[PDB]
Design a protein around this nucleic acid. Structure first.
Lengths: 74, 142, 183, 81, 168
RNA sequence: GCCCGAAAGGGUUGACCCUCCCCGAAGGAAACACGGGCGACCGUGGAGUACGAGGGGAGGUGACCGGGGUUGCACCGUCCGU
RNA sequence: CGGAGUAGGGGGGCGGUGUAAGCCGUCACCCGAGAGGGGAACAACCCAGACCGGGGUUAAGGCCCCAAAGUGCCGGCUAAGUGUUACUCCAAAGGGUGUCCCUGGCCUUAGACAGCGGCCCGUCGAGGUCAGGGGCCCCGAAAAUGGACGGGGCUUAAGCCGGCCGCCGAGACCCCGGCGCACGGACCGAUUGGUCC
RNA sequence: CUGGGGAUAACAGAGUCGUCUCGGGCGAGAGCCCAUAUCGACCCCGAGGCUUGCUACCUCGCUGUCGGCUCUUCCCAUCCUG
């Protein structure tokens, strides 16, 4: 029952903002939320208040253009 | 006494566990000490141990840091560093230890042990060096 | 993570026999054996259906590189046992003609620039040197053996003390396994 | 052994420390979907591959599966959970 | 003369009143505009400071001369407009020794004070000399006591630096 | 740990030690049974239970105890006046 | 109404001057005149204000060995022993197809390299190419007795980022008993008071 | 001469580094033409603590000193030797 989620939001670093979009495989969206926070805060040293998720949605496995996700979902 | 086979093991973790044993009152023998591994890069490690060998007391070298060049003594010295050496407790714990290169006949034909927490299996990196390599670099016998 | 599960195959020819045994690849062919050791964490090597497969199940950049590298090495071994590798060198002199000789496992070059002391270049096991006039051949079955032999012979004749625009004599590589060398 | 769909595995972590499982789907590089399909207590959940020990045993199923189907294939294959 | 780290910083009151400062020096840089002054160019290219700076007129004149020579030989006068935006009003002080008895600096020089994200210079240029404009900006950026960054403004005063960089 | 120990300190109207019960402040488990979490773990029950400073009592054993001199072990500790 | 002592102040935050060290002031939190627990050790940096005997829970912070308590859980990064430094005590401008990520243009069923020949066909046919922004690391980077992450040592960590779960740990806070003090009261005294509540 | 002072200088120490020694970035221009063989301006960024200054934290009866001779040791930013 594995779904594919798209995430869209914004994150801030040293006063400057930057939008982002990502895509994940999971069952629920709370797991997606936790993983977004973890990964972004690792790769740009950004806390969780300075991350603002504005959209989490479900899609199907051909409207996805990340190599790993696409090759795991076929 | 317990008998421990250093072969595929990590030096510092081995030493930490062994030193806690010693203080809790056991006798330990370590065999195949030339086969433990040290993790890092070769230049870094060799520089470290060379800089240690060439330490000495400028006024009299019959004093002086006597940092060793043999494998069994390298192991013994790490363990020592992990104990209170300036204390009767520690001196006795240290006297309860014995370290060998190879497996003497005396110990041949016996079942050895291995510490789970120390083992090359944990690693994810192909970067490791052996204590025998370090000894050969420094100029020690076996 | 560039990808998920990189894998690359190698088609095995008719007379060649590949086999893996404990992180050591072994290749037998119409002439000679060739063994080698290809080790990296998370990289496997096996035979599925007449192929050689190299696999890694969540690669970074420095895994992709290693995998394609192993690919190239095993292709080299196959083509080597199947055809062999051949190298050519050239000899040049302005004054002081020199003489090149083989004896056992060395290559002796005498009277190079008028020296009273010869120069010795090492041959490695499995490689045959052959002098024909001013041209030299080095033939063999392992790419690296043949290259190192050629390179030892060439480095035997090196100069560091005078201008190489005027002092150009020596022995030089001109074909590294069929491919020329131009400038 | 290696994790894959249909693989029979053991649990080494948690409340169900020591119990058998059929792996039914591959969520990511770290998470798999497990169920033991009414042959024991274990429900349908996700699990970190760290917290599982695969086995030689194995059955064949389709990617994304149900407990009745798993039970049927298990009865057919002869694997006790 | 004495290093610029002594005069970089801004943590000090302003000292700009010549009807009270005795012996205040006079400016070296006396030209702040160059090229075609009457003009309707397309692209505007300005340095902004990344943090508060205090820039000496020695440095300003160095920048002027270098940039203007470069653009005169690589662009031509009828095709560029170069402007320096800031005048040196801040008087710099030096202690004349006696030691630290009666310490209060006698004036030696001048400086321009500049705050964060402020403009310093500007080259107005057409679309087929942008490479030269940005080379000029590199040369200038290299001669300042702290760092700097450039943008590219349109008429209507809008940022187009990305759309322009991506295509040239 | 070794040594002294008559009196002035307690003690055969019973020293030291031993076990048994009752009350019990602040505090306070575990096994185990059900379920939640990828997981370290948590929730309900077990359970305010078992225990717990001290305050009382009932018995067995039958001579030391406190004190002093020196010293071992572990921890802590850079004198005095200005 | 009577009796003093004090007329060299200092840490830390703010201001004027000064290349800076420092100088001059201001604020009233601390040392001086302040024990105890931690920072390796530290006058003034963190917790915290102390009669006596005992019991228990916490703070600062810590949990691989030294050393009491986790070789703790999840996700990601670093290969340089970088780091393992709250502050006391710690290097830049300038640079990097080192690696992990965001963004936006142009290309694509024949693209971007090669090879065969004169902008092109086929040829191996699947992802490329350009710029801008960020995280960690690298170059820039040289000292004098013999060496200092506190030391041993540590590389899917015993390091860094983002979060989580349990334990250890003061004279602090809770409880039990005892001493004194200040205030008030009663009784009681051949005199500055004594016994009790 | 007395009484005293590191509440206050000369001398070595600590602190700092304007000056000092040793360096770097950028590329004007010079080099028959050629920015980088060599030189590198104007401007910008630094290390060390071997010059000199500034300050006044230690020492006013500890010793107050320059050069030379004798004797041992260290750094590298290398003069020869590889």
């Amino acid at each position: 029952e594995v779904k594919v989620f798209r995430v869209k939001g914004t994150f801030e670093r040293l006063g400057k903002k930057q939008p982002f979009t990502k895509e994940y495989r999971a069952l629920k969206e709370e797991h997606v939320r936790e993983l977004v926070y973890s990964d972004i805060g690792s790769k740009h040293r950004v806390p969780r208040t300075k991350i603002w998720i504005e959209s989490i949605e479900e899609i199907k496995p051909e409207e996805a253009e990340d190599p790993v996700v696409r090759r795991l979902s076929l | 006494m317990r008998i421990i086979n250093a072969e595929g093991l990590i030096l510092g973790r081995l030493a930490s566990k062994v030193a806690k044993m010693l203080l809790e009152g056991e006798e330990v023998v370590i065999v195949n000490a030339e086969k433990a591994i040290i993790t890092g890069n070769r230049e870094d490690i060799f520089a470290k141990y060379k800089q240690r060998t060439e330490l000495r007391t400028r006024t009299n070298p019959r004093r002086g840091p006597f940092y060793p060049k043999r494998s069994d003594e390298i192991v013994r010295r790490t363990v020592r560093g992990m104990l209170p050496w300036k204390t009767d407790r520690g001196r006795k714990a240290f006297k309860r230890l014995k370290v060998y290169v190879g497996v003497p006949k005396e110990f041949e034909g016996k079942e050895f042990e291995t510490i789970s927490e120390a083992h090359m299996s944990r690693l994810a990196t192909p970067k490791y060096v052996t204590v025998g390599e370090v000894a050969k670099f420094l100029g020690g016998k076996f | 993570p560039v990808d998920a599960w990189i894998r690359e195959e190698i088609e095995i020819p008719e007379g060649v026999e590949v086999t893996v045994e404990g992180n050591t690849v072994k290749v037998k062919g119409p002439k000679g054996e060739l063994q080698r050791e290809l080790k990296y964490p998370g990289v496997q090597i096996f035979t599925e259906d007449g192929k050689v497969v190299i696999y890694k199940e969540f690669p970074r950049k420095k895994d992709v590189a290693i995998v394609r590298t192993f690919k190239a090495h095993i292709n080299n071994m196959i083509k080597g046992v199947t055809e062999g590798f051949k190298y050519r060198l050239k000899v040049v002199y302005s004054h002081f003609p020199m003489t090149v000789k083989v004896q056992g496992d060395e290559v002796v070059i005498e009277n190079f620039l008028g020296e009273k002391n010869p120069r010795r270049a090492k041959i490695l096991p499995g490689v045959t040197v052959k002098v024909k006039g001013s041209e030299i051949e080095v033939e063999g079955i392992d790419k690296e053996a043949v290259g190192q032999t050629a390179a030892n012979i060439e480095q035997a004749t090196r100069i560091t003390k005078w201008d190489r625009r005027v002092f150009q004599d020596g022995i030089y590589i001109v074909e590294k396994a069929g491919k020329p060398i131009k400038f | 052994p290696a994790i894959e769909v249909g693989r029979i595995a053991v649990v080494i972590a948690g409340r169900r420390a020591g119990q058998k499982v059929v792996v039914a789907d591959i969520i990511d590089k770290n998470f798999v979907l497990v169920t033991g399909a009414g042959l024991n207590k274990v429900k349908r959940r996700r699990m970190n591959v760290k917290h599982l020990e695969p086995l030689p045993e194995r059955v064949n199923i389709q990617r994304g599966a149900s407990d009745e189907e798993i039970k049927a294939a298990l009865e057919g294959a002869g694997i006790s959970l | 003369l004495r290093p610029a780290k002594i005069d970089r910083d801004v943590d000090k009151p302003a000292y700009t009143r010549r009807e009270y400062i005795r012996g205040a020096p006079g400016p070296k840089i006396t030209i702040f505009d160059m090229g075609n002054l009457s003009a309707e160019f397309e692209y505007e290219v300005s340095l902004h400071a990344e943090q508060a700076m205090q820039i000496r007129q020695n440095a300003l004149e160095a920048i002027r001369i270098q940039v203007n020579r470069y653009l005169q030989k690589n662009v031509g006068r009828s095709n560029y407009h170069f402007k320096i935006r800031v005048y040196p009003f801040q008087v710099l002080r030096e202690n004349p020794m006696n030691g630290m008895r009666r310490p209060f600096g006698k004036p030696i020089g001048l400086a321009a004070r500049v705050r964060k994200d402020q403009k310093i210079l500007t080259v107005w240029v057409n679309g087929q000399h942008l490479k030269f404009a940005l080379g000029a900006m590199h040369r200038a950026k290299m001669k300042l006591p702290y760092s700097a960054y450039y943008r590219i403004y349109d008429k209507e005063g809008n940022d187009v630096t990305t759309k322009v960089l991506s295509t040239m």
